[PDB]
C-alpha cells in the first residue's frame, strides 16, 4: 500500500512546513531560533542565516499591509532548511508550551462564564467568539439583560483582571490574541493531520508487522513478546522511512525484527 506511506510522508512534510510557516509568522519563535543559532555559533548556511536576519529586520520594520505578501515570500524563502530531529522537536515543544499557556488562559476565562452563570454554550459561542478583547462580552452582555445577563457584574471583575493578564501575555507574544489563536489553530490543524498520518501508518502496518513476525513461532518466547518487540523495532525503522526504495516493505524490516527478538530471548529467556 505504497500510497499510504507516500501520502503520509509528503503530508508530514506539509505539516512541518505549516508549523514552520507559523513560526515565521510568530515573533518569539524566531527570537528563540536566532538565540539558539547564536548559542551554537557552511558558507551557504552562513549566507542563508544572513538572509534570514535581513528578512527578519525588514519584516519587523514593515509591520504596517504588504506584510502579508511579505510573510508569504518569507514562507517560500524559509523552507530551504532541512529540519534536525532534536531541534525541530524542541522548537515545536516550546511553541506548544506557549500553546498550553494560551489554552490555560482560555480555560480560566470560560470557567468564569460557563458554570458560574450556567451560560448556554450556543449563545456564548455565537456572541463571545470573534472579538475576545472588547466590551462585546464585558458590559454588552449586561446590555440585553437576558436571564443569563444579570449575575455577571458579580463576576465581570474577575473576568476583567483575568483578561488583562491575558493581554499582558498578548504583548508577551506580540500579535493580537485573535491572530495568535488563528496561527495556533493552523499549526494544530497541520499537527492533526500529522497524527492522522502516523495513525494510518500504524493501523495499515499492523497487518504487515504481524505477518512478518509470525515467521517465528517456536522460539520459546511468548507470542506477545514477539509482537511488541517486532512492532517497536519496525516503528523505529519506519521513523526515517524511505519510499524511494524499490524494495518491498518486508525487506526493510527483517534485520531489525531479528535483532529485537534476539535481544528479547537473550534477556528474558
Amino acid at each position: 500500500t505504497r500510497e499510504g506511506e507516500i501520502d503520509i510522508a509528503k503530508r508530514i512534510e506539509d505539516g512541518i512546513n505549516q508549523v514552520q510557516c507559523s513560526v515565521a509568522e510568530y515573533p518569539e519563535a524566531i527570537t528563540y531560533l536566532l538565540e539558539q543559532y547564536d548559542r551554537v555559533e557552511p558558507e551557504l548556511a552562513r549566507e542563508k542565516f544572513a538572509e534570514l536576519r535581513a528578512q527578519y529586520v525588514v519584516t519587523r520594520d514593515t509591520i504596517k499591509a504588504t506584510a502579508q505578501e511579505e510573510i508569504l515570500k518569507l514562507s517560500e524563502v524559509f523552507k530551504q532548511f532541512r529540519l534536525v530531529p532534536k531541534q525541530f522537536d524542541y522548537l515545536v515543544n516550546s511553541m506548544r508550551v506557549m500553546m498550553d499557556r494560551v489554552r490555560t488562559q482560555e480555560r480560566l476565562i470560560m470557567k468564569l462564564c460557563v458554570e458560574q452563570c450556567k451560560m448556554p454554550k450556543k449563545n456564548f459561542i455565537t456572541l463571545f467568539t470573534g472579538n475576545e478583547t472588547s466590551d462585546t462580552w464585558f458590559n454588552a452582555a449586561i446590555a440585553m439583560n437576558k436571564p443569563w445577563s444579570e449575575k455577571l457584574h458579580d463576576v465581570s471583575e474577575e473576568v476583567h483582571r483575568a483578561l488583562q493578564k491575558l493581554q499582558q501575555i498578548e504583548e508577551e507574544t506580540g500579535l493580537t490574541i485573535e491572530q495568535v489563536k488563528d496561527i495556533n489553530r493552523r499549526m494544530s490543524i497541520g499537527e492533526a493531520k500529522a497524527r492522522r498520518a502516523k495513525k494510518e501508518m500504524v493501523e495499515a502496518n499492523l497487518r504487515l508487522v504481524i505477518s512478518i513476525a509470525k515467521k517465528y513461532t517456536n522460539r520459546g518466547l511468548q507470542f506477545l513478546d514477539l509482537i511488541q518487540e517486532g512492532n517497536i523495532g519496525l516503528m523505529k525503522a519506519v521513523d526515517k522511512f524511505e519510499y524511494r526504495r524499490g524494495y518491498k516493505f518486508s525487506t526493510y524490516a527483517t534485520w531489525w525484527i531479528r535483532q529485537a527478538i534476539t535481544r528479547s530471548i537473550a534477556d528474558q529467556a
Binding site: 480555560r107 470560560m110 492533526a192 497524527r195 492522522r196
Partner: protein
C-alpha cells in the same frame, strides 16, 4: 470541550474520533482508559452542582 461545540459527556468511538481529530487536534482532549475517567472525576465540582 471548550469553544468547539464539544459536550463534556458525549462519547465518540474510534471512527468518529478520527473525524473529530481531523476537525480539531486541540480543544478535543482525547483521553482514554481509566486515566480519562479519573481526570473527569477531578473536574466535577459537587456543592455547586448539589
Amino acid at each position: 470541550g471548550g469553544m468547539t461545540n464539544l459536550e463534556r459527556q458525549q462519547i465518540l468511538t474510534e471512527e468518529q474520533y478520527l473525524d473529530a481529530l481531523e476537525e480539531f487536534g486541540d480543544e478535543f482532549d482525547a483521553k482514554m482508559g481509566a486515566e480519562a475517567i479519573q481526570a473527569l472525576l477531578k473536574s466535577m465540582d459537587l456543592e455547586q452542582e448539589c
